[PDB]
């Protein structure tokens, strides 16, 4: 009897379908996304080499219609899987890529009040900005958002101007082949991390619900469960 919130299918369908309809309403931008990708019909036979888990509006609608989502973040995840597949497969200059970006703008403007009506802090999946990275070359030096840099193992980073590795003064350093590195751009957004309400079990964002002047020695409890 731990007060876990169980979402019934009709609750999720009634709340979330208007956000899906807002995407469907976009003409022309929803047109590439209204049906499952058919690589042979479209003439893109390499599609499933790149996209391992396809997703589209019709599949999301069917999942809502048949109760396949236990909680609304799974719906949010499917919407972003659809977007991320298209941003990966298609070139930035292509119409499908640009249409995807329009759909994502619409979704971000629709999802927060809907998720709030379901008891959540908001519906935003990703952090607002790429995290600032540390540059190994200098001590002061850091890599800001949208900056170019080099990275081995997604661990050790050098800004391009600075570009014998170690992560601690006592750690014996190792020589790594320069240009074993990959050049990257600091433009990736990570998912906003969660904390679960210990009563209802809802996943809430740490940044949304945990404040600099509040402690939770016995565990986080959301506003509606207090
Ligand atoms: C998401 C899916 C697969 C994908 O990642 N890239 C892709 C490449 C070529 C065509 C389409 C595609 C498929 C179906 C489509 C369309 C495009 C369009 C369409 C309408 N206007 N424009 C520019 C494309 N309508 N339909 C039903 C497409 N989209
Ligand atoms: Na265009
Ligand atoms: Zn939030
Ligand atoms: Zn540097
Ligand atoms: Zn709660």
């Amino acid at each position: 009897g731990s007060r876990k919130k169980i979402f019934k299918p009709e609750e999720l369908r009634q709340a979330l379908m208007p956000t899906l309809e807002a995407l469907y309403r976009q003409d022309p931008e929803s047109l590439p996304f209204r049906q499952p990708v058919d690589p042979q019909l479209l003439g893109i036979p390499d599609y499933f080499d790149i996209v391992k888990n396809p997703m589209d509006l019709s599949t999301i609608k069917r999942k809502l219609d048949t109760g396949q989502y236990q909680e609304p973040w799974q719906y949010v995840d499917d919407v972003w899987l659809m977007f991320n597949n298209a941003w990966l497969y298609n070139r930035k200059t292509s119409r499908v890529y640009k249409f995807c970006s329009k759909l994502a703008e619409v979704f971000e403007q629709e999802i927060d009040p809907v998720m709030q009506s379901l008891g959540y802090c908001c519906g935003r999946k990703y952090e607002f900005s790429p995290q600032t990275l540390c540059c190994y070359g200098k001590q002061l030096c850091t890599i800001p958002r949208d900056a170019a840099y080099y990275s081995y193992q997604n661990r050790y980073h050098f800004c391009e101007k600075c570009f014998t590795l170690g992560d601690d003064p006592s750690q014996p350093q190792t020589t790594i082949s320069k240009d074993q590195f990959e050049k990257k751009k600091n433009d990736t957004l990570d998912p906003e991390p969660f904390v679960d309400c210990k009563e209802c079990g809802r996943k809430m964002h740490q940044i949304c619900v945990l404040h600099y002047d509040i402690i939770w020695p016995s565990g986080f409890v959301c506003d509606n469960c207090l």
Side-chain angles (χ1 to χ4, degrees):
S2 185
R3 296 165 63 182
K4 180 178 175 59
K5 170 62 180 182
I6 302 292
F7 295 95
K8 64 186 185 179
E10 177 61 25
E11 182 180 15
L12 296 175
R13 199 205 55 78
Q14 175 107 329
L16 300 170
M17 191 69 72
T19 71
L20 203 63
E21 288 165 334
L23 303 189
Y24 196 90
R25 283 200 297 274
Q26 308 304 308
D27 186 343
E29 294 94 347
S30 71
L31 299 175
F33 304 100
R34 289 180 176 185
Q35 57 289 306
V37 181
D38 186 337
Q40 301 304 312
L41 182 64
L42 300 171
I44 49 168
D46 68 340
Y47 183 78
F48 290 130
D49 299 331
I50 295 161
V51 173
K52 300 301 181 181
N53 291 289
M55 188 53 59
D56 72 287
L57 296 172
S58 80
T59 298
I60 297 172
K61 179 176 188 303
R62 181 64 179 166
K63 289 177 74 165
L64 283 174
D65 286 341
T66 56
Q68 295 185 46
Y69 295 125
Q70 292 91 55
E71 55 92 14
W73 286 112
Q74 293 171 311
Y75 162 83
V76 176
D77 285 351
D78 271 347
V79 169
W80 285 99
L81 174 63
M82 182 182 77
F83 296 158
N84 290 336
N85 285 339
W87 285 320
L88 171 63
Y89 181 75
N90 303 277
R91 301 185 178 283
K92 301 178 212 68
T93 50
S94 69
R95 289 241 170 166
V96 174
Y97 190 109
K98 296 174 178 178
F99 286 4
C100 183
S101 294
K102 173 61 179 182
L103 295 192
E105 174 180 298
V106 171
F107 189 72
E108 298 200 90
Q109 294 167 14
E110 296 292 331
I111 191 60
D112 287 356
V114 170
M115 290 285 284
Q116 288 156 1
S117 81
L118 293 170
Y120 291 84
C121 51
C122 73
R124 174 179 53 88
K125 179 165 179 77
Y126 294 100
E127 292 182 334
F128 290 109
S129 162
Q131 232 175 247
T132 308
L133 299 174
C134 291
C135 172
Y136 186 71
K138 301 290 180 290
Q139 289 74 16
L140 200 290
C141 198
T142 52
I143 306 167
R145 63 178 297 175
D146 296 318
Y149 71 101
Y150 298 81
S151 181
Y152 172 61
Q153 295 271 264
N154 172 223
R155 295 293 314 312
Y156 287 93
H157 315 308
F158 323 81
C159 73
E160 60 178 12
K161 191 164 196 175
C162 288
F163 197 81
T164 173
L165 272 53
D167 56 40
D168 178 84
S170 304
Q171 182 183 67
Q173 294 167 22
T174 62
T175 292
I176 179 189
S177 186
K178 157 139 81 173
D179 290 330
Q180 192 66 50
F181 296 85
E182 282 82 351
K183 203 152 148 266
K184 300 210 162 200
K185 203 189 145 104
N186 187 26
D187 64 353
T188 293
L189 304 180
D190 297 331
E192 191 65 74
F194 288 113
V195 55
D196 294 354
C197 175
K198 85 159 175 170
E199 298 302 324
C200 71
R202 283 179 176 85
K203 297 159 53 190
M204 313 290 195
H205 295 124
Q206 296 177 24
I207 197 184
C208 287
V209 305
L210 302 181
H211 306 308
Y212 70 98
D213 60 343
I214 304 295
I215 46 173
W216 298 94
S218 52
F220 167 69
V221 178
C222 79
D223 286 340
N224 298 133
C225 291
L226 283 177

